[PDB]
Design an enzyme around this catalytic site. Structure first.
Site, PDB file in Angstrom:
ATOM      1  N   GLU A  23      -0.438   4.012   8.017  1.00 29.70           N
ATOM      2  CA  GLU A  23      -0.326   3.846   6.570  1.00 29.70           C
ATOM      3  C   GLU A  23       0.932   4.499   6.010  1.00 29.70           C
ATOM      4  O   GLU A  23       1.588   3.917   5.146  1.00 29.70           O
ATOM      5  CB  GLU A  23      -1.537   4.434   5.853  1.00 29.70           C
ATOM      6  CG  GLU A  23      -2.819   3.631   5.987  1.00 29.70           C
ATOM      7  CD  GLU A  23      -2.793   2.279   5.271  1.00 29.70           C
ATOM      8  OE1 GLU A  23      -1.839   1.991   4.509  1.00 29.70           O
ATOM      9  OE2 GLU A  23      -3.735   1.476   5.503  1.00 29.70           O
ATOM     10  N   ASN A  56       2.475  -2.801  -4.874  1.00 26.57           N
ATOM     11  CA  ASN A  56       1.774  -3.996  -4.424  1.00 26.57           C
ATOM     12  C   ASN A  56       2.097  -5.194  -5.314  1.00 26.57           C
ATOM     13  O   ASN A  56       2.550  -5.065  -6.458  1.00 26.57           O
ATOM     14  CB  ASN A  56       0.268  -3.754  -4.410  1.00 26.57           C
ATOM     15  CG  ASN A  56      -0.144  -2.769  -3.348  1.00 26.57           C
ATOM     16  OD1 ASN A  56      -0.882  -1.834  -3.629  1.00 26.57           O
ATOM     17  ND2 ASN A  56       0.349  -2.953  -2.131  1.00 26.57           N
ATOM     18  N   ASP A  98       0.279  -6.992  -7.043  1.00 27.72           N
ATOM     19  CA  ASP A  98      -0.630  -7.208  -8.161  1.00 27.72           C
ATOM     20  C   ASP A  98      -0.365  -6.188  -9.262  1.00 27.72           C
ATOM     21  O   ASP A  98      -1.138  -6.120 -10.227  1.00 27.72           O
ATOM     22  CB  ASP A  98      -2.111  -7.157  -7.705  1.00 27.72           C
ATOM     23  CG  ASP A  98      -2.561  -5.757  -7.279  1.00 27.72           C
ATOM     24  OD1 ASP A  98      -1.709  -4.845  -7.172  1.00 27.72           O
ATOM     25  OD2 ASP A  98      -3.771  -5.567  -7.028  1.00 27.72           O
ATOM     26  N   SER A 128      -0.314  -2.820  -8.787  1.00 26.32           N
ATOM     27  CA  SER A 128      -0.806  -1.491  -8.444  1.00 26.32           C
ATOM     28  C   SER A 128       0.151  -0.830  -7.452  1.00 26.32           C
ATOM     29  O   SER A 128       1.052  -1.469  -6.905  1.00 26.32           O
ATOM     30  CB  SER A 128      -2.202  -1.556  -7.824  1.00 26.32           C
ATOM     31  OG  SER A 128      -2.227  -2.338  -6.639  1.00 26.32           O
ATOM     32  N   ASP A 169       0.163   2.126  -4.042  1.00 23.95           N
ATOM     33  CA  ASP A 169      -0.527   2.967  -3.058  1.00 23.95           C
ATOM     34  C   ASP A 169       0.180   4.314  -2.932  1.00 23.95           C
ATOM     35  O   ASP A 169       1.415   4.353  -2.822  1.00 23.95           O
ATOM     36  CB  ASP A 169      -0.546   2.308  -1.675  1.00 23.95           C
ATOM     37  CG  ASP A 169      -1.248   0.959  -1.659  1.00 23.95           C
ATOM     38  OD1 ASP A 169      -2.178   0.746  -2.461  1.00 23.95           O
ATOM     39  OD2 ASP A 169      -0.891   0.126  -0.805  1.00 23.95           O
ATOM     40  N   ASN A 226      -5.110   3.441  -3.514  1.00 23.73           N
ATOM     41  CA  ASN A 226      -4.607   2.434  -4.437  1.00 23.73           C
ATOM     42  C   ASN A 226      -5.016   2.710  -5.890  1.00 23.73           C
ATOM     43  O   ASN A 226      -6.165   3.073  -6.167  1.00 23.73           O
ATOM     44  CB  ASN A 226      -5.113   1.061  -3.985  1.00 23.73           C
ATOM     45  CG  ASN A 226      -4.559  -0.068  -4.821  1.00 23.73           C
ATOM     46  OD1 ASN A 226      -5.142  -0.454  -5.831  1.00 23.73           O
ATOM     47  ND2 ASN A 226      -3.439  -0.635  -4.380  1.00 23.73           N
TER      48      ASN A 226
END
Ligand code: CL
Ligand code: NA
Length: 129
Positions: free
Chosen positions: A35, A46, A48, A50, A52, A59
Protein backbone atom coordinates in the site's frame (compact mmCIF):
# COMPACT_ATOMS: atom_id res chain seq x y z
CA UNK A 1 8.86 8.09 8.66
CA UNK A 2 9.90 5.13 6.47
CA UNK A 3 9.80 1.97 8.61
CA UNK A 4 12.01 -1.06 8.22
CA UNK A 5 10.35 -4.45 7.84
CA UNK A 6 11.09 -5.92 11.28
CA UNK A 7 10.72 -2.49 12.91
CA UNK A 8 7.16 -2.18 11.62
CA UNK A 9 6.33 -5.79 12.59
CA UNK A 10 7.41 -5.08 16.19
CA UNK A 11 5.34 -1.88 16.33
CA UNK A 12 2.19 -3.50 14.98
CA UNK A 13 2.62 -6.35 17.49
CA UNK A 14 2.90 -3.86 20.40
CA UNK A 15 -0.32 -2.24 19.10
CA UNK A 16 -2.29 -5.52 19.10
CA UNK A 17 -2.55 -6.47 15.42
CA UNK A 18 -1.04 -9.97 15.70
CA UNK A 19 -3.97 -12.33 15.08
CA UNK A 20 -6.55 -9.53 15.29
CA UNK A 21 -9.77 -10.93 13.78
CA UNK A 22 -7.79 -14.00 12.84
CA UNK A 23 -5.15 -12.22 10.70
CA UNK A 24 -1.56 -13.16 11.54
CA UNK A 25 1.08 -10.43 11.76
CA UNK A 26 2.57 -11.15 8.32
CA UNK A 27 -0.71 -10.19 6.62
CA UNK A 28 -0.53 -6.66 8.05
CA UNK A 29 3.15 -6.22 7.14
CA UNK A 30 2.47 -7.42 3.58
CA UNK A 31 -0.43 -4.98 3.20
CA UNK A 32 1.64 -2.02 4.43
CA UNK A 33 4.47 -2.87 2.01
CA UNK A 34 2.32 -2.84 -1.11
CA UNK A 35 0.00 0.00 0.00
CA UNK A 36 2.63 2.56 1.06
CA UNK A 37 6.16 1.05 0.73
CA UNK A 38 6.31 1.41 4.57
CA UNK A 39 6.04 5.26 4.34
CA UNK A 40 3.73 6.91 6.92
CA UNK A 41 3.49 10.08 4.75
CA UNK A 42 2.13 8.41 1.58
CA UNK A 43 -0.95 10.03 -0.02
CA UNK A 44 -2.79 9.10 -3.21
CA UNK A 45 -5.74 10.84 -4.91
CA UNK A 46 -8.55 8.65 -6.24
CA UNK A 47 -10.72 8.99 -9.34
CA UNK A 48 -13.81 9.79 -7.26
CA UNK A 49 -12.38 12.82 -5.42
CA UNK A 50 -11.31 11.01 -2.25
CA UNK A 51 -7.73 10.55 -0.99
CA UNK A 52 -5.94 7.60 0.67
CA UNK A 53 -3.67 8.41 3.65
CA UNK A 54 -0.81 6.81 5.51
CA UNK A 55 0.91 3.48 5.95
CA UNK A 56 -2.33 1.52 5.31
CA UNK A 57 -3.83 3.97 2.76
CA UNK A 58 -7.11 4.63 4.59
CA UNK A 59 -9.71 6.41 2.46
CA UNK A 60 -11.41 9.79 3.11
CA UNK A 61 -14.79 8.78 1.62
CA UNK A 62 -15.61 6.60 4.65
CA UNK A 63 -13.02 6.73 7.42
CA UNK A 64 -11.47 10.18 8.08
CA UNK A 65 -12.19 13.86 7.51
CA UNK A 66 -9.96 15.88 5.17
CA UNK A 67 -12.32 18.82 4.49
CA UNK A 68 -12.44 18.23 0.70
CA UNK A 69 -14.41 14.98 0.11
CA UNK A 70 -18.05 16.16 -0.14
CA UNK A 71 -20.73 13.83 1.16
CA UNK A 72 -18.25 11.57 2.92
CA UNK A 73 -18.28 9.99 6.38
CA UNK A 74 -15.72 10.09 9.21
CA UNK A 75 -16.26 6.65 10.78
CA UNK A 76 -12.94 6.62 12.67
CA UNK A 77 -13.66 10.17 13.97
CA UNK A 78 -10.23 11.59 13.10
CA UNK A 79 -8.68 14.15 10.75
CA UNK A 80 -6.96 12.32 7.90
CA UNK A 81 -3.71 14.17 8.76
CA UNK A 82 -3.50 12.07 11.97
CA UNK A 83 -2.88 9.03 9.74
CA UNK A 84 0.44 10.47 8.44
CA UNK A 85 2.16 10.55 11.85
CA UNK A 86 5.37 8.72 12.70
CA UNK A 87 3.34 7.17 15.54
CA UNK A 88 1.03 4.53 14.01
CA UNK A 89 -1.55 4.55 16.87
CA UNK A 90 -4.25 6.32 14.85
CA UNK A 91 -3.73 4.14 11.75
CA UNK A 92 -3.87 0.93 13.82
CA UNK A 93 -7.04 1.89 15.74
CA UNK A 94 -8.84 2.87 12.53
CA UNK A 95 -7.65 -0.29 10.74
CA UNK A 96 -9.15 -2.35 13.58
CA UNK A 97 -12.56 -0.79 12.81
CA UNK A 98 -12.20 -1.39 9.06
CA UNK A 99 -11.31 -5.08 9.35
CA UNK A 100 -14.33 -5.65 11.62
CA UNK A 101 -16.75 -4.18 9.05
CA UNK A 102 -17.60 -7.52 7.43
CA UNK A 103 -15.23 -8.09 4.49
CA UNK A 104 -12.08 -8.60 6.55
CA UNK A 105 -8.82 -7.63 4.93
CA UNK A 106 -10.43 -7.69 1.45
CA UNK A 107 -11.09 -3.95 2.09
CA UNK A 108 -7.42 -3.41 1.11
CA UNK A 109 -7.14 -4.01 -2.64
CA UNK A 110 -3.36 -4.56 -2.46
CA UNK A 111 -3.81 -7.27 0.21
CA UNK A 112 -6.41 -9.20 -1.80
CA UNK A 113 -4.33 -9.02 -5.00
CA UNK A 114 -0.77 -9.43 -3.67
CA UNK A 115 -0.91 -11.02 -0.17
CA UNK A 116 -4.01 -13.27 0.08
CA UNK A 117 -3.13 -16.90 -0.55
CA UNK A 118 0.65 -16.38 -0.33
CA UNK A 119 3.22 -17.36 2.32
CA UNK A 120 2.78 -14.26 4.48
CA UNK A 121 4.96 -15.66 7.32
CA UNK A 122 7.92 -14.75 5.09
CA UNK A 123 7.27 -11.09 5.89
CA UNK A 124 8.24 -11.55 9.56
CA UNK A 125 11.05 -14.08 9.02
CA UNK A 126 14.17 -13.27 10.96
CA UNK A 127 12.54 -10.62 13.17
CA UNK A 128 12.91 -10.48 16.96
CA UNK A 129 9.30 -10.32 18.19
CL1 CL B 1 -12.33 -12.59 7.92
NA1 NA C 1 -14.59 11.99 5.20
Amino acid sequence: KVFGRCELAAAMKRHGLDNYRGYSLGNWVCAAKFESNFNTQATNRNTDGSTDYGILQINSRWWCNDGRTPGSRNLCNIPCSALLSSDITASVNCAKKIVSDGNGMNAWVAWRNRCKGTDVQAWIRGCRL
